[PDB]
Design an enzyme around this catalytic site. Structure first.
Site, mmCIF file in Angstrom:
data_model
loop_
_atom_site.group_PDB
_atom_site.id
_atom_site.type_symbol
_atom_site.label_atom_id
_atom_site.label_comp_id
_atom_site.label_asym_id
_atom_site.label_seq_id
_atom_site.Cartn_x
_atom_site.Cartn_y
_atom_site.Cartn_z
ATOM 1 N N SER A 200 25.436 -9.866 42.298
ATOM 2 C CA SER A 200 24.938 -11.184 42.480
ATOM 3 C C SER A 200 25.891 -12.273 41.791
ATOM 4 O O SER A 200 26.951 -12.489 41.875
ATOM 5 C CB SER A 200 23.567 -11.074 42.375
ATOM 6 O OG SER A 200 22.755 -12.085 43.230
ATOM 7 N N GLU A 325 20.910 -7.802 53.105
ATOM 8 C CA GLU A 325 21.323 -8.953 51.787
ATOM 9 C C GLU A 325 20.272 -10.291 52.064
ATOM 10 O O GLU A 325 19.930 -10.811 50.773
ATOM 11 C CB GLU A 325 22.645 -9.744 51.910
ATOM 12 C CG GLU A 325 23.754 -8.586 51.731
ATOM 13 C CD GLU A 325 23.918 -8.416 50.051
ATOM 14 O OE1 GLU A 325 23.088 -8.861 49.191
ATOM 15 O OE2 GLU A 325 24.462 -7.608 49.591
ATOM 16 N N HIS A 438 18.685 -6.743 48.606
ATOM 17 C CA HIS A 438 19.661 -7.189 47.733
ATOM 18 C C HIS A 438 19.261 -6.563 46.344
ATOM 19 O O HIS A 438 18.051 -6.582 45.725
ATOM 20 C CB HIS A 438 19.630 -8.700 47.768
ATOM 21 C CG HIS A 438 20.373 -9.162 46.624
ATOM 22 N ND1 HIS A 438 21.589 -9.366 46.852
ATOM 23 C CD2 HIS A 438 20.108 -9.722 45.239
ATOM 24 C CE1 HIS A 438 22.405 -10.090 45.926
ATOM 25 N NE2 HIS A 438 21.376 -10.132 44.830
#
Ligand SMILES: *[C@@H]1O[C@H](CO[C@@H]2O[C@@H](C)[C@@H](O)[C@@H](O)[C@@H]2O)[C@@H](O[C@@H]2O[C@H](CO)[C@@H](O)[C@H](O)[C@H]2NC(C)=O)[C@H](O)[C@H]1NC(C)=O
Ligand SMILES: *[C@@H]1O[C@H](CO[C@@H]2O[C@@H](C)[C@@H](O)[C@@H](O)[C@@H]2O)[C@@H](O[C@@H]2O[C@H](CO)[C@@H](O)[C@H](O)[C@H]2NC(C)=O)[C@H](O)[C@H]1NC(C)=O
Ligand SMILES: NC(=O)c1cc[n+](COC[n+]2ccccc2/C=N/O)cc1
Ligand SMILES: NC(=O)c1cc[n+](COC[n+]2ccccc2/C=N/O)cc1
Ligand SMILES: *[C@@H]1O[C@H](CO)[C@@H](O)[C@H](O)[C@H]1NC(C)=O
EC number: 3.1.1.7
Lengths: 530, 533
Positions: A200, A325, A438
């Site tokens: 990330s 995601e 995610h």
């Protein structure tokens, strides 16, 4: 007395600790000071190298977590608490960690350096899910991770000023990389084989170090999981950074940059944290107040321009995404979403969701989004809408920026490997509809399933071990592949090949959401311009 | 003399001819004058009703084709020649045709009225493929078709002027419809049951009669085949009409640009028809396929607002409409100028040729809009596959000009009161002389509708004769009842939501959903917002 736990680095002597794994012991050195504490007059300033100390620094436990917001959406829920600080907050937080085989390597061992994510507003190197012991024991690398300042402490910027220049959190990371160049050999590490990996905002950070020449000499390979320096959340322009800094000051009762930063420096850390989110221009998910600023210094241009201009011959990069995601982010303010129901939304909720997951674009831009992502044979079906809004958020923020990065790097000389991570952990505590969310490939890369006290299946352990092998292969050779037995081919702008990572053997596929990403990467910029 | 071939209509007496068909005799009255010849002083003017006559007019063969350009792209080729004039060209062309059963119906019979296409610059009711004798024999309707002026003669407009008001080719059509009202009963037809059908520009023309109150009173149902009055090629604004008209006059020496409208038109009227025709294509803004110089103009008169607006704003309760398209609407248009396209090879174009084609097939849009077309129609896993590019450019041209305008018309009409039935014609005729890659091209459903395979001089299969009889049955069913279903799998109405339509081929009816729904969302919903901003 164990001499394997005694180490001398340039600044002084360290006492580490021995850790257990199901595969045997590991040496760990936790809470090593690498900067002077960035407190008082040093808030918002670049990190200073840590001055030498006498006696022995006790490096047997993690150090404090840099001041940050604490997530309260689902109090005590595993799926959110696993990301929250697990040590006391403090501005005195610039420490790093080293895990190494036991006994210490006596020949140069390749180094993995982890950079945590958290939207540049949160995260710690002490989270259980970042535990380096399994990777080090299994693949016999050296592993390093650092804390870096986040939120306003790391990224508040009044461009031009000496008092708050911006990007100091990025400098924290660079200092830690410098530290590694100078001291990793004392642990058995090889400073000439250093691989950066991050997820990330950690992956965004890795790419920013790629695009900034003074960092580029500090490592050799790069891994980017579910993030990219060109993501629309990862940077901010000078003007907008000045506006946000200025609004924070007003919000906390502060008034000339010198006067402004001085009054900010008189405020308790917790007060800045309490107000940081109220400086964003609109309601959103996936946007963060204080982020890397493009100002000519750390980044001489935008990450996009820099990616296009670069000669990337000699670079090997591993990049990838999880299967879903966008789902995780939707429960943080998209109308109609919750982890506790099916989140089957109405077309009107979808329409409102889109302005939330694609903030600060024109009406015409939002319309184009709704056009692409509506199935016009089923414009109002709740399930499809939930999945389509998830695609919108995921594609805009993660998948298409990663796809753009991979294509431009491969086309400009780099060797790129791409993955989609498609395994839903048997232990996953988020609802089924969220799919593979995610951040839930990390625990597999770090081999957390090998911990017996946790409840993964036998097959998930074999899987973790495969992933750990791919990653360490890549760190050692620039190529994740194991000897010919199915093979993981390089990603190229034309063939666009990547592999699926799950319990099944590697499967080769084409296109990181190619149709969707043409929209975001090719059409939508043309629109906003003209 | 034979009684069945003698008819009296309000203007005088007519004599017709007896036609042989496979299934038996038909009465035809071909070449009936319905207007004074729009000659000399009457060029560019509204049609005048034909003055009454003494004695008997022989209506025994088709009259002349209205002056028009003649396609020369593939000379002697069947696929093009079938559409070219098959009578001499003349400005004296305002005649219509009536076919009726033999003997003449005892009780009032439903009327089908046919309006040919041809981009408003060409076409004629005398084409073999519009032969009405088979429909009338098989289904016992009365069939009427008319000639109407085309090109500058029909649609040159200097808005506001008396001497060239524009839309006179539409007024020609209206006059013919008025003629049907006042006279069709003398042929045994029912003036209270009149169904307009047309194809391409004829379908656009049908749609404009829907949206113009004085036309709307002259018929009861409507059939739009591969054409819609909201198509981007189908109308022009006042200023652009004037610009084109003015450029035309300039290009032929009038005046010796602009000025008094009366002087300019008078100078236009002194030019030979063939001279006007020879210059008419030089007035288009860019080079394109699918754009025509003189088309209906939106000027507050025939059309009080744009077709889009009128469609959106209308009440359509009490209306039945049948609409459809062929499977490959765009392919036919590509060989008239898109780079890399020819009927005589595979037209496997390159990426550069595809991009260049998007500008030719979607003329006069911004670069941003073209970029958006390329985004939607490129397969980004195969951006350069020639076959895919050929197919996509055909889809672009097809969707923009025919399918999405019809889809939009269909949906608004359904939503606002009307019963709508929708088809896609998917059979590739065994006799088709165009290459296989063109698939089922624009206009090649017509010959089945008119039952042309029943013609013993032609070499259609037996299945195609059966298929043509099915189609004729649907259209006549629709004309009789407003419902094409046999009063076998059922043909359901089309609605904005379920968007159902049937495939028309040798197999039985299959029900499917969405007329290129994803593609047409782009053209009908997003792209107009792009043009505003
Ligand atoms: C699914 O849940 C959302 C979120 O609502 C929260 O979580 C629920 C499980 C329940 O405990 C609610 O009380 C919580 O507020 C629902 O969307 C909410 O709807 C209420 C209706 O009064 C509204 O006041 C909230 O603002 C909505 N929240 C959001 C984020 O939009 C949604 O209705 C649920 N789906 C159902 C019930 O089918
Ligand atoms: C496919 O045909 C087009 C059309 O060209 C004509 O038709 C051919 C079947 C053949 O009879 C040609 O000799 C004709 O000129 C070809 O496109 C043309 O290419 C030439 C150059 O070779 C050029 O001068 C023309 O302007 C082109 N016309 C158009 C409309 O682009 C095309 O190259 C052919 N493809 C092949 C042969 O693979
Ligand atoms: N008031 C605050 O300082 C603040 C800080 C950060 N956040 C973000 O928390 C939500 N969140 C938490 C974890 C992961 C992603 C997200 C999505 N953000 O948009 C909210 C308030
Ligand atoms: N009057 C003219 O100069 C002229 C030139 C070209 N065209 C159109 O070109 C031919 N065409 C183009 C596209 C589709 C069909 C056809 C067939 N025409 O009869 C019309 C008028
Ligand atoms: C154009 O010329 C005519 C012919 O003499 C004359 O009536 C006037 O000058 C102009 N007519 C109009 C209607 O403007």
């Amino acid at each position: 007395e164990d001499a394997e736990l005694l180490v001398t680095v340039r600044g002084g002597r360290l006492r580490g600790i021995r850790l257990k794994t199901p595969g045997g012991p590991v040496s760990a050195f936790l809470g090593i000071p690498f900067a002077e504490p960035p407190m008082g007059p040093r808030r918002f300033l670049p990190p200073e190298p840590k001055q030498p100390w006498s006696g022995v620094v006790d490096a047997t436990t993690f150090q404090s977590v840099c001041y940050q917001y604490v997530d309260t959406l689902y109090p005590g829920f595993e799926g959110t608490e696993m990301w929250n600080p697990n040590r006391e907050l403090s501005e005195d937080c610039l420490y790093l960690n080293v895990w190494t085989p036991y006994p210490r390597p006596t020949s140069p061992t390749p180094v993995l350096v982890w950079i945590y994510g958290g939207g540049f507003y949160s995260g710690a190197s002490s989270l259980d899910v970042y535990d380096g012991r399994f990777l080090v024991q299994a693949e016999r690398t050296v592993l390093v991770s650092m804390n870096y300042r986040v939120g306003a402490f790391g990224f508040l910027a009044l461009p031009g000023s000496r008092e708050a220049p911006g990007n100091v959190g990025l400098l924290d990371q660079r200092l830690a990389l410098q530290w590694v160049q100078e001291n990793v050999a004392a642990f058995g590490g090889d400073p000439t084989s250093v691989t950066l990996f991050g997820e990330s905002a950690g992956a965004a950070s890795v790419g920013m170090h790629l695009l900034s020449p003074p960092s580029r000499g500090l490592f050799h390979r790069a891994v980017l999981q579910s993030g990219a320096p060109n993501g629309p959340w990862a940077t901010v322009g000078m003007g907008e950074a000045r506006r946000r800094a200025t609004q924070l000051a007003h919000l906390v009762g502060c008034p000339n940059d010198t006067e402004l930063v001085a009054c900010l420096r008189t405020r308790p850390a917790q007060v800045l944290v309490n107000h940081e989110w109220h400086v964003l221009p609109q309601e959103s998910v996936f946007r963060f107040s204080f982020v890397p600023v493009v100002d000519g210094d750390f980044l001489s241009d935008t990450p996009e321009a820099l990616i296009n201009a670069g000669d990337f011959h000699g670079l090997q990069v591993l990049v990838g995404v999880v299967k879903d995601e966008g789902s995780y982010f939707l429960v943080y303010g998209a109308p109609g979403f919750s982890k506790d129901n099916e989140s089957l939304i109405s077309r009107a909720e979808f329409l409102a969701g889109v302005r939330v997951g694609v903030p600060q674009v024109s009406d015409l831009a939002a319309e184009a989004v709704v056009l692409h992502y509506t199935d016009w044979l089923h414009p109002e079906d709740p399930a499809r809408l939930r999945e389509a809004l998830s695609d919108v958020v995921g594609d805009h923020n993660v998948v298409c920026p990663v796809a753009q990065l991979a294509g431009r790097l491969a086309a400009q000389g780099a060797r790129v490997y791409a993955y989609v991570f498609e395994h839903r952990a048997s232990t996953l505590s988020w609802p089924l509809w969220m799919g593979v969310p995610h951040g839930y490939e990390i625990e597999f890369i770090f081999g957390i399933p090998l911990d017996p006290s946790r409840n993964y299946t036998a097959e998930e352990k074999i899987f973790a071990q495969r992933l750990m092998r791919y990653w360490a292969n890549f760190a050692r050779t620039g190529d994740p592949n194991e000897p010919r037995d199915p093979q993981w081919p390089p990603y190229t702008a034309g063939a666009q090949q990547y592999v699926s990572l799950d319990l099944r053997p590697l499967e080769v596929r084409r296109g990181l959401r190619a149709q969707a990403c043409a929209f975001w990467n090719r059409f939508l910029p043309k629109l906003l311009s003209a």
